[PDB]
Assembly symmetry: D2
């Protein structure tokens, strides 16, 4: 009868998710500056920098190191954008805001989850909390944000979280435009899909999101987990060689989703 309540369990991840890497250039202004298996995109403009995702909470100083290596001081970081506000992508946002000039733009769903530090998650409860942060600007579906002339467009793709967002922008490479699509996760890891009281239209939202991702302007696809789009950040000059199209990414995710639905019904 002498059994204490369990200790808090820390959110632990594969080592490669926490393996620092030097900046890897994607296009003329766009760099991967996160870890080998977590995306954090730096977009550098004549009028300041944008960060899309930060990865895990303990990655803040690494990101700042890579920004510095790129010529970006804490004051130069103007804007943080997010794919979705889980601990492994928005983890260091609170600390980055404290240590830089960065302000956060996000949709309402991502803002309230971020402001909760990821607590009371629809699926994971309080299992994956991180330092809470406030959004400085609330964006609507299809809204644009422009920094130093690079134009970022929000495309809501609710499912993995209610606030899951794809961000698209046009960069250059070899004098030619490169339409980059940073599409969010389309996974539903351990989720109850059917009849979920916390997310009654979950399935309809995922289906709509597959269609949204399929139709993005998308010369180059990147995802918060690089493996999801067949990126290999450790592969240097061939890091993006095997990358999926947005269409292939959406199709793969939908096939997996359909399998999961069938297993849920059986399980």
């Amino acid at each position: 009868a002498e059994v204490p309540l369990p200790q808090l369990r820390a959110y632990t991840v594969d080592a490669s998710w926490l393996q620092p890497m030097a900046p890897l250039q994607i296009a003329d202004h766009t760099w991967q500056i996160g870890t080998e298996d977590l995306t954090a995109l730096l977009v550098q403009t004549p009028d300041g920098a944008v960060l899309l995702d930060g990865g895990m909470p303990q990655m803040a100083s690494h990101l700042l190191d890579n920004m510095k290596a790129r010529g970006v001081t804490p004051r130069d970081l103007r804007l943080i954008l997010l794919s979705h506000a889980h601990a492994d992508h928005a983890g260091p946002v609170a600390e980055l805001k404290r240590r830089t000039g960065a302000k956060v733009a996000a949709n309402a769903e991502s803002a309230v989850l971020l402001a909760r530090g990821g607590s009371d998650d629809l699926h994971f409860g309080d299992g994956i909390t991180y330092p809470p942060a406030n959004a400085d600007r609330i964006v609507m579906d299809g809204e644009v944000i422009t920094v130093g002339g690079i134009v970022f467009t929000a495309h809501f793709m609710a499912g993995h979280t209610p606030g899951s967002t794809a961000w698209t922008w046009t960069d250059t490479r070899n004098g030619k435009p490169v339409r980059i699509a940073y599409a969010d996760s389309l996974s539903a890891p351990g989720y109850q899909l059917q009849g979920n009281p916390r997310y009654p239209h979950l399935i309809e939202d995922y289906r709509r999101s597959f269609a949204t991702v399929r139709a993005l302007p998308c010369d180059v696809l990147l995802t918060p987990h690089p493996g999801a789009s067949n990126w290999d950040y450790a592969a240097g000059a061939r890091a993006g060689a095997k990358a999926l199209t947005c269409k292939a990414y959406a199709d793969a995710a939908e096939q997996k989703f359909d399998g999961q639905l069938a297993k849920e019904t059986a399980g």
Copy 2:
């Protein structure tokens, strides 16, 4: 050169801090309903219940079980008060608000720390975060809150946190009034005391707080860590026999503090 960033570390505590106990009566309306080494006080009135502190985050269901055993349903819990908003005392507040009718009253300092889930701590950084919660009412020093005729008075005693508070109220036992003082921690565990840029008047605040605690109306002293006031919750009918006076508690804390100052100067 292949070294990943460290995993997040969970806030782990002595087993006794997480050891559930049945409700232990302190006075006619006042019960200890937390664990063997973390205080959570239930005050039951004809017009609803008050909880002072909740302990650790994983204690929410245990607290609700003990409330139920006391005749208090989730709807009957009206108010949560806090000693200070660290993870081991305010841990389950967010979840309790979700699962009960309880609203939170706290001073501004405790409210902003609670709303941060204990992140960006003046001394511990992000090492001890917990689910964030919002305060429903902001209280000033000396302000009273009355529930079912039990009158709670706030006495600010800044130091351990900027928002550290003692709560006092008068209960009964054997037809006679019992002035209960729930005084906050007066410890400064691993704190930089002198010349702390995040807390420049830390020492002056602690000194003022020793004086405040010394003068509280105090037939019976209780503390968030029971050992600090020489309570032994596991000792049944003699649980409070060895309890310190508020004067002795303050004197002991000040002596320890003075020792720590001298060691800091030497160290």
Copy 3:
């Protein structure tokens, strides 16, 4: 050259919007307790009361008076729900939370607008601000909330605000079920509809919302502005005689919307 900046202008409304009325019964548990031209619905259950909308900020005490007349004390009010978080419907929510046991449930969009006190409105800027309030529970589209056995279902109908919601529930009258639909505004008063940078999919959302409202379970329709559904709260026993169906309400709103689009294109 001696011209000061203009004085702040107060949000002023037709007198009838501020004309108090006694409670008007809609069904066995459902009462209109607002003013002659602003809806505030009280639903009374064996397990506490629900308020849907509060009207204008200065209506808080009137609402509390009408609740008292109905047998509902401040402690009995459990839940506040909202159509949308503009000043003339969510106005007194902050004060009601301070003065009652009520907690607020709303979607993310309505929560962030409520938390801003209606400032930085997509269309009205800071022209219609009110006291800010926090949401205690975030609801998803189609999610249910149950109080004393009355089941409330959320139906998002974005347009008038991003967070505009219809609430439906089943009450009784004469032993027979009455499916009540409290549908939000479908107006777009002075809005820029086409190419709005703050709301790029505004038109698509309104169209979807007309379809949503048309299909609601709807024996009885009520709207935040009673005139919108042809209610006349001052008409006593015939107050709801001329009420529109949800289908007629949606059709009328869509026709008006189409006219407004055509005028915008011309204007």
Copy 4:
């Protein structure tokens, strides 16, 4: 019996409070850029600008115009500091944050009042609300903030609001240092001073605040209402000629306060 609830009343002020003025230089880096009777101080450094107070809500564009005239673009504004978070000093803060790079630093008391948009004021209720804004950094008493080498020190002086703050910094004029003290209001306009349930130690805090203001480093005193320190912003080259010392300002305020106490006791 046909009497509607009263219309909302706008917070209206003397015309001179809203009368724009060109920037007026105080010292080498410090400018008054508000209106003739509301202070808004711009401090310009090689590493960005600081704004102390903004005045009324409708002053945002005027402030931005004056900043531009000074060579300060929206991106150059790094920090907003506040005397206290009433509508006539923090009014345009939300809008300035939206339109500039500025982040807000304030103590906990001022932060929670700012976050409420000045609603539920201890003395004025909801009579003087303004757009709410979030603080980006919480400061403690005596804490310093450094921008481009100008060092700002916070001195809490609770009373007029719980979060009332004096800010001090050292600028230059004619090669000599000029210790500037921006001391908050010490007025208590229509306040209940004795036995105020919302502010039980009000009198003790004011007394402490008179002593704090008296002892500030103070070659030049400025106040949120210039008349309080005998500044005349419209008087050009003699604008500050008649300015009070911090000692004289504190003495005058204490004398007035004592008179008010005596009248309250009589009244």
